[PDB]
Structure formats: C-alpha cells, structure tokens
C-alpha cells in the first residue's frame, strides 16, 4: 500500500464515500474511530470484529502513562496493545512555545508511539470573542507550520505516516476561511475541523460546518474531532465530513446507555429487568446474537465487568453499522433518504 | 447422556482420573470449576476456551439478585448467562428450621436456577470445640436428609439433576466418620468435603483429608469446597479429591496476581514494566500468545478493565492446564513424579 492515498468513489451532495489506503491497512470512509492504550473493555480483535478499520490513541495520556519513550522501547503502540491496523493519535485538547508540550514534542511523541495518522499540535474555548478566537487561530496556524516542519524533518515518520492539520476559528466564518487558507498553503494529507463539540449545540455546530467544510481541500479527508451522537454523525456527513472519533459509545456503554435504531435506551431502567429481547432488534453484533436486555440490565446494576464489556461491544458495533449504512447509501445515491428515515425512527 | 454417571479410568495411589457424564455434558476429573451469574470479566465462550467443563453458581447471591424466580421466568441460569454446559450451585456458606434459607428453599432455589449439580444445605467455624463441631455436624446431617427428600420430591429435578451431600466434622476424625456414615446411609450422587479452607492451614487441611476422604464412597466423586491454590489442588488430588472450586484465579487476577509454573507473580511490580515476556513461559492461553507482561502491568496499574479481563483469562487457563497435567499424569501412572516436579519448580 502507499503511505497515504484517499480516493472518493461516490458522492451525493456534499457527502462522500471512499477509502484511505495506508501501509497498515485500508480505511473505509465515512469512518468512525473508536477511542483508546486500550479501547476500554475490549480486546483489539473484538474492536476489529465490530468493523473498525482504525482506532484513536492519545498523545496526552500515553505520554504520562506509560510514557512515549517506554512504548517505543517496547516496539511501539501497535505491538504494545495488539492492534496492527492504522492508529490516529491526537496531538495533546500557555506560551507561543507550547504548553507546560510544544508542536515539536507532540510530533515526536506521536512518532515514538508509531502513529499512522499524526495530528498537528493546536490550541479555542466556547464561547469566544472574535478577538480571542482570532489570536488562538493564528497561534494554531503558526503551530501547524511547526508541526509540518517537525514531521518532515523526521524521515521515517514522513515516509510512513500521514499528517493532518486542524482548522480553528470558533464559530466565525472569516476566521475559519483564514485558517483553511493557511492550512492549505502549508499542505497536509487531511484536514480536521477543530474547535467544535465544545458546548455550542447541534444547530450551531451544523451552521459552522455548513460554511467551514467547503473551505477545505475537497480531495483530502475531512475529520470532525470529537463528534459524536449518531444524529451528529449523519448531519456532519451530509455536510462533507469523512472521519469521526468520540468517546460516547464506549463511555456511554459503561454507564448503561445502549444505542438502538429507535434511539438510545438506559439499560439500568427497571423496565428491562425481564426483557428477553436483545439490546437492538436489528443489530448483527455478537452481543445481540447471544444475550438479553434482562441479563445486561442485571450485570450493569450489579457493577459487573462483563456488563461493561457487552454494552461497549454492542455500542461500537452499532456505530460501525451506522457508518456502513451511510457508506452504502451514499454509494447508492440514497443517503438523503437514509438520513431522513434514520432521524424519523431514531427520534 | 445419563442424568449422572461417574466412571474412573485410571488410578495412582489415592488419586483418580475419569469422567462425570451428565445431560448437559461431560466433566473431566480431577476438575476445576471456575466460580461465577457471570465468571467475572469473562464471556462464557472464553471460559469454555480455557478448558472448563463446568462452572459454579451461588444460591445466596442469585437469590438476592436478580432473584431465583426471575431467573426461572427468564428460562433459567444457563439461558440467562449463556453457558450451556453443567452448572454446580452451592446451597447458600440460626434455627433447626434454617437461617434467616432452609434446606427445602435452598433446593427449590437451585431448581429454579436449573442447577445440574445441587448441593445439600449445610451448616462449622474454625477453630471449633469438639462439642460445637458435633452439634453442627449433626444438624448438617439432619439437613442433608431434608435436602435429599426435597430434591427427590421434585420429579423434574430428580430426573435431570444430581445431588451432592457435604461432610462436616471440623478437624475431628470421629465426627468426620459419623458424618460420612450418615451421608452414605442417605445416599447421594457425590460427596463434598465441607468445613475446610476456613482458616486451618495447608498442613492441617491435608491431615484431615488424609483420614476423611477414604471414609467417603470410593465410587462417587469427592468435591473439596473452596480449594484452592495450585499446591492445595495437587496435594488434595494426592489424597483422593476429584473436584475443586475457588475464587482465587478470578479474584487474584483482578488484583494483579498471575499464576505461573514458577509460582505466582504480582504484575503490578515495577520489575514488569518493560518485560516483553508473556505472563508464563509455557502457557498456551490466548493472553500469553498475544500480550506482554509490560502491557498487562500497564493496564492493571491504570485500572483498565482489559487488565482484569486478560489476567482472569490467563489465570483460569492456567488452572485448567494444571488440571489437564494432573489428569494426564494420573492416566500415565506418573502423578507422584508430576506432583514432586511441580512443587520443586513452583516453590
Ligand atoms: C468532544 N469534542 C471535541 N473533542 C475534541 C478534540 C479531541 C478529539 N478526540 C480525542 C480536539 N482535539 C484537537 N486536537 N483539537 C480540537 O479542536 C479538538 C476539538 C474537540 N472537540
Ligand atoms: C474458601 N473455602 C471454603 N469455601 C467453602 C464453601 C463454598 C465453596 N465455594 C462456593 C463451602 N460451602 C458449603 N456449602 N459448605 C462448606 O463446608 C464450605 C466450605 C468452604 N470452604
Ligand atoms: Zn448489538
Ligand atoms: Zn497464559
């Protein structure tokens, strides 16, 4: 495989479906990346069986424990945790130099972990005034150039990994445009939309995506960081987003929240205590094949680890099934119909 | 298969190896029964993959949550938890009537759960005076007859399950003999040695097994309740024990203790932080195939659920491998050699 190739196979409006090819494997887009040096309560083989093509790791947590250098001594993150496919690492979400973490150190840590997709080191709270959002965006663009240069100066990294830049600008169209321009001038393998899902609400997030995603190079992947709920994902794909990561399915799962095509349910609710149905009626996951709502209700009420395991496997599988229906519906020119049907039933 | 058939295929001194056949499957003896309505941190398929033929469930915990009647409404324990092979249930470890639980209720609960091997309801703290141990043993034998009659009066249970009686008597040879006599006069499908592993220490436990196990019918299985460490198991098999249950491998596992052929290790110890070796050098389990001491050290230090999962899978697999080496060495007439070699290396 090449270091990085993104190809778009089908479109419908702003939505796209395709593939990213990398040395460690192929990523089907739109993609959901489960968040990890573990996807909580799941073996990597289980994560793969749900359909994930790539997972996310964190520069912040891993650098603290067990340490980036230690992981590199041990053979890198893939070998450490037993996941042999692509890994995307966030950059580590104050001075011009960095945070006491700088762009250079961030890129180095991601190298030491052996990340396949490296994120530029970026700085913007919500709400923000125009002045503050601009100051922050500009710093982020200076740090984006430092990230680019640090990555390129490390031959092994530049030859085997990819680098994504992150658009800032808060909710302001002019700053988003400046930011997109800056990032394209530097040039990256993909472009994230940063600075959303930080308290603005779906309506506002969608409004900003509406003008922001078209500013980015059309021929490169578009990653919406930290999103989100199933309906956030569907709307964001309608606006041109190709990649997602979020802790909801894992975290939610351990707290009793199961995703279903008829909306989320809280399995701890006494109404499930004698419910022999699977979590979701249509889900093809191993959990829905084998165990009832009643059993999983019991496990979660009892604080049993197997409850966390089963809830998490189901939720990540649900999310992968969602992404597959999105991909197929775009490939078949019926994604707008799918999005409408999905929302009518989910809500 | 028959309701219950125990056949001995080979012997060496007091040690025996063979099979129990039941409707839900065959049990290889000497057997280790992992303790559960879940074996903590493991899917039942994982439990089976380690080599377990039977697991234990509890009348006490299940009757409290989620309730015996609820589990029967839901189709019984096997269907509830997704384990289709035999399950042994303890009886629920004060008046002549029972505990505020009586023999009759205990047997009924085990029926409602759908237990394959039902334990008689029994009462003896350590240390105990001869007078108190005798009083307690005698009550237990009256309760053993009540258990027998309750089981036999329920046709479905008597036709499809087995009933084991439990020997008491503390550390006193004469009371153990009276107890064995009483139980044989009533007649059971198997015989447990109760009242050990309650604080007496290995030397004393072995001394009591030395005279107590020969008192029991030779042609029926002998179950040592709540034992134990790998060396306890080996010594107890040398004294005629066929069946074991213990929470050590599961509980220990979650606390960082891994069993190995060179003795237990605590994986949280900083010495393992960069150790790329598997938990045990010879172990054939999936955990030792795939992950390092270093990774598992990190997970347990970090309190990650996957740490508990992997430690537990390894430890239960270790125990099953131990039981297989015992079975094979008895079948080959070299168990005394095995026991000596095991101890020399383990210690
Ligand atoms: C929960 N919402 C959210 N998460 C964000 C992250 C982390 C992505 N997940 C790890 C971000 N990381 C970065 N680096 N930048 C963001 O703007 C950024 C923005 C985010 N918004
Ligand atoms: C930990 N040691 C130990 N556990 C015992 C149990 C429970 C077996 N595991 C469930 C027992 N259950 C019973 N019923 N009787 C015992 O004497 C009895 C004795 C035990 N000794
Ligand atoms: Zn499911
Ligand atoms: Zn192992």
XYZ file of C-alpha atoms and ligand atoms in Angstrom:
738
model
C 0.000 0.000 0.000
C 1.090 3.646 -0.339
C 1.929 5.853 2.656
C -1.358 7.654 2.044
C -3.949 7.744 -0.708
C -7.516 8.995 -0.401
C -9.899 8.117 -3.209
C -13.560 9.149 -3.447
C -15.761 6.510 -5.085
C -19.195 8.101 -4.819
C -20.887 11.362 -3.871
C -24.286 12.667 -3.016
C -24.500 16.400 -2.436
C -21.692 17.239 -0.005
C -21.451 13.642 1.223
C -18.640 11.378 0.028
C -17.721 7.735 0.369
C -14.362 6.185 -0.421
C -11.175 4.762 1.019
C -7.914 5.873 2.591
C -5.102 3.432 1.842
C -2.149 3.345 4.225
C 0.697 0.916 4.846
C -1.087 -0.736 7.766
C -4.435 -1.073 6.006
C -7.426 0.421 4.260
C -9.889 2.771 5.916
C -13.457 2.960 4.613
C -14.924 6.420 4.688
C -17.085 7.852 6.267
C -15.233 6.255 9.161
C -15.825 6.057 12.895
C -12.685 5.682 15.025
C -13.178 4.065 18.421
C -11.164 5.836 21.089
C -8.495 4.067 23.142
C -3.623 2.130 25.118
C -6.885 0.205 25.114
C -10.395 0.613 23.724
C -11.966 0.306 27.157
C -13.286 -3.169 27.946
C -12.492 -4.621 24.513
C -9.746 -6.819 23.079
C -8.468 -5.408 19.782
C -9.792 -8.458 17.939
C -13.256 -7.561 19.237
C -12.788 -3.980 18.103
C -11.900 -5.263 14.644
C -14.823 -7.679 14.592
C -17.237 -4.794 15.035
C -15.865 -3.368 11.783
C -13.393 -0.716 12.898
C -10.634 -0.025 10.386
C -8.692 2.434 12.569
C -8.658 3.482 16.219
C -7.561 6.628 18.002
C -4.841 6.846 20.664
C -3.931 9.959 22.757
C -0.603 11.831 22.967
C -1.547 13.302 26.391
C -2.499 10.186 28.326
C 0.138 7.940 26.804
C 2.910 10.400 27.336
C 2.004 10.436 31.023
C 1.484 6.704 31.357
C 3.198 4.547 30.406
C 5.431 7.089 28.616
C 6.197 7.583 24.909
C 9.788 6.519 25.168
C 8.852 3.378 27.090
C 6.308 2.445 24.440
C 8.881 2.974 21.703
C 11.383 0.809 23.630
C 8.709 -1.867 23.736
C 8.147 -1.775 19.998
C 5.554 0.926 19.593
C 1.838 1.225 20.283
C 0.659 -1.269 17.700
C 2.762 -4.057 19.128
C 2.125 -2.968 22.751
C -1.660 -3.098 22.535
C -2.059 -5.730 19.855
C -3.661 -3.638 17.124
C -1.935 -3.981 13.783
C -4.086 -1.642 11.702
C -3.856 2.180 11.435
C -3.877 4.338 14.560
C -4.635 8.036 14.583
C -3.159 9.977 17.506
C -4.474 13.310 18.746
C -1.773 15.841 19.480
C -2.452 16.539 23.156
C -7.187 19.210 23.848
C 0.495 28.702 27.799
C 3.247 30.318 25.694
C 3.991 30.664 21.979
C 6.456 27.843 22.650
C 3.778 25.318 23.722
C 2.046 24.288 26.960
C 3.552 23.352 30.341
C 4.131 20.153 25.251
C 5.117 22.038 22.107
C 4.459 21.240 18.436
C 7.868 19.597 18.109
C 7.477 17.362 21.204
C 3.936 16.484 20.209
C 5.122 15.290 16.799
C 7.990 13.429 18.450
C 5.720 11.638 20.883
C 3.426 10.590 18.050
C 6.485 9.263 16.258
C 7.616 7.319 19.334
C 4.166 5.803 19.630
C 4.373 4.934 15.892
C 1.145 6.719 14.918
C -0.055 6.268 11.312
C -2.085 9.462 11.269
C -0.386 12.304 13.185
C -2.342 15.369 14.203
C -0.803 18.813 14.174
C -0.447 20.421 17.604
C -3.139 23.063 18.018
C -4.633 25.342 20.638
C -10.316 27.637 21.442
C -12.861 27.659 24.297
C -16.570 28.225 23.625
C -17.872 30.822 23.639
C -15.024 33.028 22.414
C -14.918 36.634 21.388
C -13.814 37.367 17.810
C -10.526 38.812 19.115
C -9.580 35.748 21.227
C -10.741 33.298 18.580
C -8.514 35.085 16.052
C -5.488 35.189 18.388
C -5.933 31.492 19.104
C -6.463 30.541 15.490
C -3.343 32.423 14.430
C -1.225 30.685 17.033
C -2.654 27.391 15.917
C -1.635 28.145 12.348
C 1.910 29.015 13.420
C 1.961 25.740 15.362
C 0.600 23.946 12.286
C 3.674 25.059 10.303
C 5.964 23.967 13.153
C 4.172 20.609 13.203
C 4.610 20.217 9.435
C 8.305 21.013 9.605
C 8.903 18.708 12.611
C 7.169 15.833 10.868
C 9.002 16.376 7.581
C 12.392 16.546 9.297
C 11.973 13.019 10.571
C 12.471 10.759 7.580
C 10.917 7.595 8.929
C 7.868 9.440 10.033
C 7.451 11.418 6.855
C 7.874 8.290 4.718
C 5.499 6.022 6.631
C 2.910 8.232 8.386
C 0.436 10.949 7.388
C -0.067 14.435 8.878
C -3.405 16.170 9.337
C -3.851 19.889 10.011
C -6.669 21.268 12.208
C -8.896 24.207 11.297
C -9.785 26.650 14.165
C -11.682 29.907 14.133
C -14.501 29.235 16.584
C -17.887 29.953 15.000
C -16.619 32.833 12.825
C -16.725 32.363 9.062
C -13.925 34.768 8.300
C -11.512 33.147 10.757
C -12.437 29.689 9.520
C -11.587 30.831 5.984
C -8.249 32.301 7.022
C -7.486 29.138 8.878
C -8.389 26.902 5.933
C -6.303 29.081 3.644
C -3.340 28.877 5.991
C -3.544 25.130 6.274
C -3.850 24.569 2.544
C -0.861 26.803 1.942
C 1.188 24.636 4.282
C -0.309 21.475 2.838
C -1.430 18.388 4.779
C -2.632 14.855 3.987
C -6.005 15.600 5.590
C -7.850 18.380 7.375
C -9.685 18.313 10.650
C -12.377 20.687 11.737
C -11.276 21.609 15.257
C -12.943 23.667 17.895
C -16.442 22.176 17.716
C -18.389 19.932 20.037
C -17.144 22.171 22.846
C -20.521 23.457 24.044
C -22.205 25.152 21.074
C -25.057 22.747 20.387
C -26.005 20.821 17.256
C -27.711 23.653 15.442
C -24.712 25.923 15.760
C -22.259 23.122 15.005
C -24.131 22.342 11.783
C -24.235 26.030 10.826
C -20.498 26.287 11.184
C -19.908 23.047 9.261
C -22.107 24.399 6.519
C -19.579 27.120 5.605
C -16.393 25.590 7.062
C -16.082 22.215 5.356
C -16.271 23.637 1.779
C -13.268 25.793 2.628
C -11.079 22.717 2.981
C -9.434 20.897 0.032
C -12.137 18.708 -1.476
C -9.708 15.982 -2.482
C -8.454 15.329 1.070
C -10.270 13.720 4.011
C -12.213 15.926 6.428
C -12.143 14.884 10.095
C -14.609 16.229 12.678
C -12.858 15.872 16.033
C -14.835 14.542 18.981
C -18.192 14.021 17.259
C -20.459 12.433 18.276
C -24.008 11.209 18.737
C -25.451 9.143 15.846
C -27.510 12.108 14.609
C -24.470 14.388 14.783
C -22.608 11.937 12.555
C -25.381 11.714 9.979
C -25.730 15.527 9.722
C -21.980 16.017 9.595
C -21.649 13.516 6.738
C -24.410 15.494 4.937
C -22.045 18.461 5.264
C -18.908 16.801 3.920
C -17.235 15.040 6.890
C -15.358 11.788 6.268
C -13.948 10.868 9.691
C -15.172 10.847 13.277
C -13.968 9.952 16.750
C -15.895 10.093 20.024
C -15.869 8.516 23.477
C -19.652 8.340 23.662
C -20.173 4.701 22.584
C -17.533 3.413 24.994
C -18.169 5.756 27.926
C -21.953 5.683 27.440
C -21.849 1.939 27.293
C -20.186 1.551 30.668
C -22.818 3.877 32.171
C -25.743 1.831 30.879
C -26.605 3.681 27.692
C -27.150 1.451 24.651
C -27.643 2.844 21.160
C -30.536 1.471 19.106
C -32.169 2.384 15.748
C -35.120 3.614 17.789
C -32.889 5.861 19.959
C -30.741 5.365 22.998
C -32.002 3.336 25.952
C -30.713 3.178 29.541
C -30.448 -0.498 30.308
C -30.499 0.074 34.064
C -34.182 1.058 33.828
C -36.353 -1.424 35.698
C -38.462 -1.844 32.563
C -35.668 -4.024 31.152
C -35.386 -6.367 34.102
C -37.408 -9.174 32.410
C -36.977 -8.118 28.770
C -35.702 -11.080 26.768
C -35.139 -9.055 23.576
C -31.595 -8.145 22.541
C -30.441 -4.531 23.020
C -31.466 -3.759 19.441
C -33.870 -5.666 17.218
C -31.803 -5.425 14.063
C -28.234 -5.301 15.345
C -25.972 -8.001 13.974
C -23.426 -7.862 16.805
C -22.404 -10.889 18.859
C -23.980 -9.355 21.981
C -27.418 -9.095 20.362
C -26.991 -12.622 18.982
C -26.434 -14.113 22.410
C -27.665 -12.100 25.452
C -30.847 -10.383 26.573
C -31.625 -6.910 27.792
C -32.543 -8.581 31.085
C -29.119 -10.153 31.558
C -27.256 -6.981 30.613
C -29.549 -4.999 32.925
C -28.586 -7.353 35.750
C -24.846 -7.115 35.015
C -24.826 -3.307 34.880
C -26.973 -2.996 38.015
C -24.569 -5.348 39.738
C -21.480 -3.423 38.574
C -20.101 -6.491 36.781
C -17.261 -6.068 34.345
C -18.991 -8.257 31.768
C -21.783 -5.647 31.693
C -19.270 -3.018 30.570
C -17.799 -5.439 28.046
C -21.107 -6.309 26.432
C -22.523 -2.788 26.413
C -19.326 -1.466 24.821
C -19.136 -4.165 22.159
C -22.714 -3.504 21.196
C -22.320 0.282 21.062
C -19.168 0.256 18.973
C -20.776 -2.288 16.658
C -23.850 -0.089 16.397
C -21.666 2.833 15.381
C -19.842 0.708 12.767
C -23.216 -0.490 11.370
C -24.287 3.140 11.182
C -21.159 4.012 9.224
C -21.741 1.072 6.881
C -25.322 2.158 6.171
C -24.052 5.660 5.465
C -21.359 4.357 3.108
C -23.758 2.097 1.271
C -26.491 4.723 0.978
C -24.044 7.260 -0.470
C -22.710 4.648 -2.905
C -26.320 4.011 -3.996
C -27.374 7.660 -4.213
C -29.965 7.359 -1.439
C -28.202 8.911 1.523
C -30.558 11.846 1.852
C -33.447 9.349 2.078
C -31.469 7.294 4.600
C -30.758 10.403 6.726
C -34.428 11.324 6.823
C -35.570 7.744 7.611
C -32.877 7.369 10.239
C -33.918 10.558 12.020
C -37.645 9.775 11.861
C -37.110 6.445 13.580
C -34.245 7.441 15.928
C -36.246 10.361 17.277
C -26.190 -38.814 28.172
C -27.437 -40.171 31.518
C -28.583 -37.921 34.377
C -25.358 -38.827 36.166
C -22.598 -41.368 35.698
C -19.126 -41.227 37.219
C -16.521 -43.574 35.790
C -12.910 -43.895 36.963
C -10.475 -44.655 34.137
C -7.151 -44.651 35.965
C -5.692 -44.526 39.465
C -2.427 -43.882 41.172
C -2.440 -44.311 44.931
C -5.442 -42.339 46.194
C -5.582 -40.206 43.042
C -8.190 -40.892 40.362
C -8.944 -39.635 36.885
C -12.162 -40.150 34.963
C -15.361 -38.544 33.763
C -18.771 -37.494 35.031
C -21.400 -37.703 32.299
C -24.497 -35.535 32.649
C -27.251 -34.431 30.287
C -25.584 -31.089 29.587
C -22.114 -32.524 29.019
C -19.093 -34.453 30.194
C -16.866 -33.364 33.056
C -13.234 -34.489 33.129
C -11.951 -35.268 36.576
C -9.974 -34.023 38.514
C -11.932 -30.905 37.619
C -11.579 -27.229 38.454
C -14.830 -25.237 38.447
C -14.482 -21.512 37.821
C -16.756 -19.521 40.097
C -19.461 -17.206 38.761
C -24.349 -15.032 37.095
C -21.002 -14.357 35.458
C -17.433 -15.627 35.716
C -16.079 -12.162 36.432
C -14.641 -10.407 33.384
C -15.132 -13.361 31.027
C -17.662 -14.291 28.352
C -18.788 -17.906 28.754
C -17.193 -18.796 25.420
C -13.872 -17.612 26.855
C -14.444 -19.686 29.970
C -15.036 -22.715 27.764
C -11.997 -21.971 25.619
C -9.766 -22.195 28.672
C -10.990 -25.776 29.094
C -13.661 -25.537 31.777
C -16.279 -28.277 31.595
C -18.483 -26.933 34.410
C -18.812 -23.703 36.379
C -20.181 -22.884 39.805
C -23.079 -20.518 40.538
C -24.282 -19.383 44.026
C -27.706 -19.850 45.662
C -27.066 -16.901 48.045
C -26.088 -14.158 45.620
C -28.502 -15.154 42.883
C -31.424 -15.440 45.206
C -30.767 -11.857 46.275
C -30.083 -10.510 42.807
C -31.619 -10.934 40.366
C -33.854 -13.450 42.191
C -34.397 -17.188 41.637
C -37.939 -16.834 40.444
C -36.975 -14.097 37.991
C -34.217 -16.269 36.562
C -36.626 -19.174 36.177
C -39.139 -16.867 34.438
C -36.346 -15.914 32.068
C -35.543 -19.507 31.206
C -33.068 -20.489 33.870
C -29.426 -19.718 34.586
C -27.955 -21.476 31.583
C -30.004 -19.463 29.138
C -29.664 -16.236 31.185
C -25.871 -16.218 31.253
C -25.164 -18.072 28.039
C -23.492 -21.178 29.436
C -24.973 -24.389 28.110
C -22.810 -26.909 29.954
C -23.215 -28.200 33.545
C -23.509 -25.769 36.448
C -22.941 -26.698 40.063
C -24.704 -24.480 42.605
C -23.644 -24.113 46.226
C -26.511 -24.219 48.677
C -26.113 -20.835 50.364
C -21.575 -20.645 53.431
C -29.970 -19.771 63.099
C -32.655 -22.368 63.916
C -33.168 -26.071 63.218
C -35.527 -24.796 60.517
C -32.801 -22.954 58.548
C -31.238 -19.475 58.527
C -32.915 -16.047 58.420
C -32.994 -20.118 53.959
C -33.863 -23.697 54.877
C -32.925 -26.983 53.184
C -36.217 -27.029 51.291
C -35.920 -23.433 49.983
C -32.281 -23.978 49.110
C -33.177 -27.000 46.982
C -36.051 -25.058 45.438
C -33.859 -22.122 44.507
C -31.332 -24.452 42.902
C -34.195 -25.975 40.949
C -35.429 -22.552 39.817
C -31.934 -21.688 38.665
C -31.849 -25.063 36.827
C -28.657 -26.315 38.501
C -27.200 -29.604 37.195
C -25.335 -30.398 40.391
C -27.299 -29.400 43.519
C -25.571 -29.142 46.867
C -27.276 -30.169 50.071
C -27.939 -27.317 52.501
C -25.418 -27.490 55.330
C -24.217 -25.504 58.314
C -18.723 -25.057 61.111
C -16.376 -22.188 62.055
C -12.664 -22.799 62.667
C -11.499 -23.415 65.257
C -14.367 -25.327 66.866
C -14.586 -27.285 70.058
C -15.486 -30.980 69.745
C -18.922 -30.277 71.263
C -19.850 -27.471 68.810
C -18.395 -29.305 65.831
C -20.537 -32.327 66.734
C -23.712 -30.260 67.251
C -23.130 -28.560 63.912
C -22.314 -31.756 62.078
C -25.448 -33.437 63.403
C -27.643 -30.574 62.278
C -25.980 -30.694 58.908
C -26.797 -34.382 58.623
C -30.444 -33.761 59.508
C -30.458 -31.019 56.867
C -28.808 -33.430 54.419
C -31.797 -35.791 54.762
C -34.212 -32.872 54.312
C -32.260 -31.834 51.214
C -32.427 -35.378 49.812
C -36.161 -35.613 50.377
C -36.840 -32.135 48.914
C -34.851 -32.955 45.802
C -36.488 -36.355 45.335
C -39.988 -34.920 45.727
C -39.477 -32.729 42.698
C -39.661 -35.028 39.701
C -38.043 -32.805 37.115
C -35.170 -32.083 39.384
C -34.645 -35.649 40.476
C -34.767 -36.889 36.874
C -32.412 -34.322 35.354
C -30.060 -33.094 38.115
C -27.665 -34.657 40.630
C -27.438 -34.131 44.411
C -24.230 -33.985 46.422
C -24.017 -34.309 50.208
C -21.424 -32.422 52.302
C -19.293 -33.973 55.037
C -18.720 -31.822 58.204
C -16.992 -32.629 61.455
C -14.310 -29.949 61.643
C -10.868 -31.494 62.139
C -12.132 -34.421 64.252
C -11.754 -37.912 62.813
C -14.615 -39.429 64.741
C -17.100 -36.753 63.670
C -15.923 -36.971 60.077
C -16.593 -40.722 60.185
C -20.062 -40.285 61.653
C -20.786 -37.691 59.049
C -19.578 -39.881 56.180
C -21.616 -42.771 57.534
C -24.713 -40.608 57.761
C -24.340 -39.323 54.244
C -23.759 -42.746 52.739
C -26.812 -44.074 54.532
C -28.899 -41.346 52.929
C -27.152 -41.814 49.606
C -26.008 -39.064 47.222
C -24.580 -38.820 43.693
C -21.362 -37.307 45.056
C -19.781 -36.240 48.325
C -18.167 -32.979 49.247
C -15.675 -32.432 51.997
C -17.053 -29.347 53.741
C -15.669 -27.275 56.528
C -12.095 -26.873 55.278
C -10.196 -23.941 53.860
C -11.736 -21.899 56.674
C -8.514 -20.921 58.452
C -6.725 -24.147 59.410
C -3.717 -24.021 57.103
C -2.467 -26.470 54.486
C -0.789 -28.888 56.845
C -3.914 -29.341 58.914
C -6.167 -29.441 55.858
C -4.048 -32.238 54.380
C -4.067 -34.141 57.682
C -7.828 -34.053 57.777
C -8.126 -35.067 54.112
C -5.821 -37.956 54.834
C -8.417 -39.690 57.044
C -11.611 -38.040 55.746
C -11.638 -38.794 52.027
C -11.285 -42.607 52.463
C -14.442 -42.518 54.563
C -16.491 -41.466 51.552
C -17.844 -43.899 48.912
C -14.940 -44.628 46.586
C -17.157 -44.989 43.538
C -18.608 -41.460 43.764
C -16.913 -38.108 43.113
C -15.247 -36.275 46.003
C -15.507 -32.471 45.964
C -13.289 -30.221 48.104
C -15.238 -26.986 48.530
C -13.396 -23.694 48.160
C -9.910 -25.042 47.426
C -7.638 -23.524 46.317
C -4.071 -22.574 45.496
C -2.337 -24.730 42.840
C -0.352 -26.610 45.502
C -3.509 -27.206 47.541
C -5.094 -28.788 44.471
C -2.148 -31.067 43.759
C -1.976 -32.317 47.384
C -5.728 -32.760 47.573
C -5.743 -34.855 44.390
C -2.972 -36.979 46.001
C -5.500 -37.578 48.786
C -8.453 -38.585 46.626
C -10.228 -35.339 45.604
C -11.894 -35.163 42.187
C -13.480 -31.694 42.112
C -12.496 -28.177 43.120
C -13.880 -24.655 43.097
C -12.185 -21.446 44.225
C -12.359 -17.703 43.618
C -8.593 -17.287 43.748
C -7.819 -17.324 39.996
C -10.544 -14.794 39.218
C -10.223 -12.567 42.290
C -6.416 -12.825 42.342
C -6.321 -11.970 38.693
C -8.182 -8.702 39.101
C -5.776 -7.746 41.910
C -2.674 -8.294 39.795
C -1.696 -11.812 40.790
C -0.840 -14.114 37.877
C -0.187 -17.821 38.328
C 2.901 -19.284 36.656
C 4.704 -22.678 36.755
C 7.449 -20.894 38.673
C 4.968 -19.520 41.261
C 2.651 -16.570 41.444
C 3.815 -13.122 40.355
C 2.300 -9.692 41.066
C 2.171 -7.983 37.714
C 1.944 -4.519 39.260
C 5.580 -4.824 40.388
C 7.745 -2.251 38.638
C 10.076 -5.050 37.545
C 7.495 -5.965 34.890
C 7.136 -2.513 33.395
C 9.405 -3.288 30.382
C 9.163 -7.095 30.408
C 8.174 -8.293 26.945
C 7.723 -11.934 28.013
C 4.214 -13.353 28.380
C 2.849 -13.917 31.908
C 4.069 -17.515 31.774
C 6.708 -19.023 29.510
C 4.845 -22.227 28.772
C 1.198 -21.207 28.994
C -0.830 -21.917 25.884
C -3.561 -19.359 26.596
C -4.564 -16.624 24.159
C -3.277 -13.951 26.564
C 0.244 -15.405 26.615
C 0.087 -15.811 22.828
C -0.620 -12.142 22.262
C 0.303 -9.691 25.084
C 3.314 -8.911 27.243
C 3.834 -8.629 30.958
C 4.614 -4.967 30.281
C 1.250 -4.264 28.666
C -0.704 -6.116 31.346
C 1.329 -4.306 34.014
C 0.301 -1.006 32.432
C -3.390 -1.966 32.220
C -3.593 -3.115 35.846
C -1.676 -0.074 37.116
C -4.068 2.092 35.149
C -7.166 0.301 36.489
C -8.267 -0.672 32.972
C -10.957 -3.273 32.548
C -8.952 -5.080 29.875
C -6.297 -5.710 32.551
C -8.859 -7.620 34.619
C -10.036 -9.475 31.525
C -6.588 -10.628 30.480
C -5.353 -11.517 33.957
C -8.501 -13.564 34.597
C -8.378 -15.413 31.284
C -4.782 -16.336 31.903
C -5.356 -17.498 35.484
C -8.358 -19.660 34.699
C -6.473 -21.126 31.746
C -3.503 -21.810 33.996
C -5.760 -23.680 36.395
C -7.298 -25.718 33.539
C -3.783 -26.572 32.241
C -2.886 -27.670 35.755
C -5.917 -29.946 35.870
C -5.033 -31.384 32.461
C -1.473 -32.177 33.555
C -2.868 -33.857 36.655
C -5.330 -35.913 34.600
C -2.703 -36.954 32.099
C -0.093 -37.802 34.729
C -2.564 -39.997 36.626
C -3.600 -41.708 33.381
C 0.101 -42.405 32.719
C 0.982 -43.537 36.242
C 3.396 -40.658 36.857
C 1.364 -38.311 39.016
C 3.543 -38.661 42.083
C 6.533 -37.630 39.932
C 4.498 -34.753 38.489
C 3.492 -33.575 41.995
C 7.097 -33.543 43.150
C 8.363 -31.769 39.989
C 5.524 -29.276 40.144
C 6.282 -28.364 43.752
C 10.046 -28.119 43.203
C 9.567 -25.601 40.417
C 6.507 -23.753 41.806
C 8.264 -23.135 45.104
C -15.607 16.285 22.404
N -15.480 17.296 21.379
C -14.239 17.586 20.957
N -13.203 16.784 21.125
C -12.165 17.443 20.548
C -10.804 17.143 20.392
C -10.336 15.736 20.754
C -10.852 14.611 19.783
N -10.949 13.327 20.494
C -9.696 12.797 21.042
C -9.961 18.083 19.746
N -8.632 17.845 19.567
C -7.819 18.734 18.965
N -6.504 18.498 18.807
N -8.304 19.899 18.506
C -9.605 20.181 18.622
O -10.009 21.349 18.139
C -10.480 19.286 19.252
C -11.822 19.585 19.402
C -12.649 18.664 20.055
N -13.973 18.729 20.327
C -12.942 -20.828 50.792
N -13.051 -22.091 51.486
C -14.274 -22.637 51.572
N -15.278 -22.313 50.776
C -16.306 -23.097 51.188
C -17.637 -23.235 50.768
C -18.057 -22.534 49.480
C -17.422 -23.141 48.175
N -17.308 -22.108 47.133
C -18.566 -21.502 46.685
C -18.482 -24.151 51.447
N -19.783 -24.326 51.083
C -20.598 -25.185 51.725
N -21.886 -25.339 51.369
N -20.143 -25.914 52.756
C -18.868 -25.812 53.145
O -18.492 -26.569 54.168
C -17.993 -24.922 52.508
C -16.680 -24.790 52.924
C -15.853 -23.874 52.265
N -14.555 -23.562 52.487
Zn -25.843 -5.359 19.184
Zn -1.437 -17.618 29.793
